[PDB]
């Protein structure tokens, strides 16, 4: 999980398969859908919570009433500073949390795959897996869907691993 | 039989700012700041605003002779003037409580 | 001849974003004025070349 993938444009997170039946990239439906829903909800919550009222910012004053004009300027400057500081901090925190959440999702998918197999795939260290036993399209679909059966291919994986 | 786990990438060059690093490239970003405007005065609440570029509120309400050609609207949402608002009170004088009257006339049902 | 919710003196603003940096003086249900010039939320992944 070092470099990005330009061959996957149907999902933020997904897998790449390659066997005797072909090769390609396939986005994981459930994880991508959950991430999309959560990000959309975050954006909608950020945008919607800004309550707006029919107001008229900016009041004209006479030359004599300079004190009230200075008070209005001070109020406007205070509101501007508060809004700028709060918006900057919110944007920074949200960006950091989103990046951390994406990294956590990738790590969780990797951990889920490793927990599902736990012996069947040699780890290269770059996020890839090398299946000891022969795997077809059905096996790849079962692994991606999460319904992989350990004892069905455990014997074959052990036999292939004990060869070396 | 090789299986790898990766993440989406593209040619997007959008830049975002984080509290730990700056100018980090991301696949997509959402803008929360509006810097584009139509450049035209529209209607608010579906009511046509009044334009008084060649006159002034004092000159309008007082019926200044140079403001006769201006039409009278039944209702408006806000009052718009321009810098060249030299036609106010033609006869010299002081308009007492002018600011309050100016404020009260901004929106009339 | 147009209908909008916010009327900034420079020009009308028809949007739903909570922040705007065009002009502090606004009329209507306008977004709050911010002195900053770049507010972007990172929603996608960290793009890196490969």
């Amino acid at each position, epitope marked *: 999980i070092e470099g990005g993938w330009t*061959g*996957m*444009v*149907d*999902g*933020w997170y*997904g*897998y*790449h*398969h390659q066997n005797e039946q*072909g*090769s*390609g*990239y*396939a*986005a994981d439906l459930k994880s*991508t859908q959950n991430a*999309i829903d959560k*990000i*959309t909800n975050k954006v909608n919550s950020v945008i919607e919570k800004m309550n707006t009222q029919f107001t008229a910012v900016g009041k004209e004053f006479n030359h004599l009433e300079k004190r009230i004009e200075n008070l209005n300027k001070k109020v406007d400057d205070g509101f501007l500073d508060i809004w700028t500081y709060n918006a900057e901090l919110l944007v920074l925190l949200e960006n950091e949390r989103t990046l951390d959440y994406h990294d956590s999702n990738v790590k969780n998918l990797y951990e889920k795959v490793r927990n599902q197999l736990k012996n069947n795939a040699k780890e290269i260290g770059n996020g890839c897996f090398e299946f000891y036993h022969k795997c077809d*399209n059905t096996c790849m679909e079962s692994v991606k869907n999460g319904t992989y059966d350990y004892p069905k291919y455990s014997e074959e994986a052990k036999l292939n691993r004990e060869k070396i | 039989d090789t299986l790898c786990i990766g993440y*989406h990438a*593209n040619n*997007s060059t959008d830049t975002v700012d984080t509290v730990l690093e700056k100018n980090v490239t991301v*696949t*997509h970003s*959402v803008n929360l700041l509006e810097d584009k405007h139509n450049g035209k005065l529209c209607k608010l609440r579906g009511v046509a605003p009044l334009h008084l570029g060649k006159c002034n509120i004092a000159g309008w309400i007082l019926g200044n002779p140079e403001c006769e050609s201006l039409s009278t609207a039944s209702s408006w949402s806000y009052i718009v003037e321009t810098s060249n608002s030299d036609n106010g009170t033609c006869y010299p004088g002081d308009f007492i409580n002018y600011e309050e009257l100016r404020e009260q006339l901004s929106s009339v049902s | 001849d147009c209908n909008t919710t916010c009327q900034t003196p420079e020009g009308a603003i028809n949007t739903s974003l909570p922040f705007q940096n065009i002009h502090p003086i606004t009329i209507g249900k306008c977004p709050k004025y911010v002195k900053s010039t770049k507010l972007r939320l990172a*929603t*996608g992944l960290r793009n890196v070349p490969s």
Partner: antibody
Amino acid sequence: EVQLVESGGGLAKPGGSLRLSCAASGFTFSTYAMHWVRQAPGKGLEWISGINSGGGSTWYTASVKGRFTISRDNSKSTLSLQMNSLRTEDTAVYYCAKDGGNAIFGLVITNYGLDSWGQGAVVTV
Amino acid sequence: SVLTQPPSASGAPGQSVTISCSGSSSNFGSNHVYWYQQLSGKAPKLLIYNNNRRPSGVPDRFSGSKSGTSASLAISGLQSEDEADYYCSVWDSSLNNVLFGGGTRLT
């Protein structure tokens, strides 16, 4: 306006093999999924198979599993459908179509459906 | 799962007609539906998109709705050219297949 070209039709004896080719232009072929849908002569439509925009995900119905193969090339923007063990029921008009894409933060989410159809290739057994 | 449609529909010119589509509650409610129009010997064209919208070039007289497990397609301002076949398409995740109806004939 997208353009779709379909070829490979003709007459094939029962128990033989056949190949259908679909070419697309006017849109990025690597960002939209594809579907092959058959229609019997005088009957209704019948979805046959499909493949994802980035490949790696082939969807088949119960009546075509183990019989039809889908292979797409994004560099050539071509799609090949290979049919084996042909039967008299296979006589129909096949259509190559693209899928719908939802734009979510610059991401194209595949939606099950067909936006623009091809022209139709008649296969008789 | 299977999809059922009326064998045919009838309507005088200038009136409105309704076409009903039904299916299994497990998949129809969760997923979306599509209505397609096919002429006589012509390539079918999509009419109803995302259960509420329509592609470009589709007249506004067509309308679509989805209540419960039943989808309804309404056609107003019926014309001679509008006489064509209509199909209902859904997606099923239990079988992972695109299901099409038997077709409806409008006259």
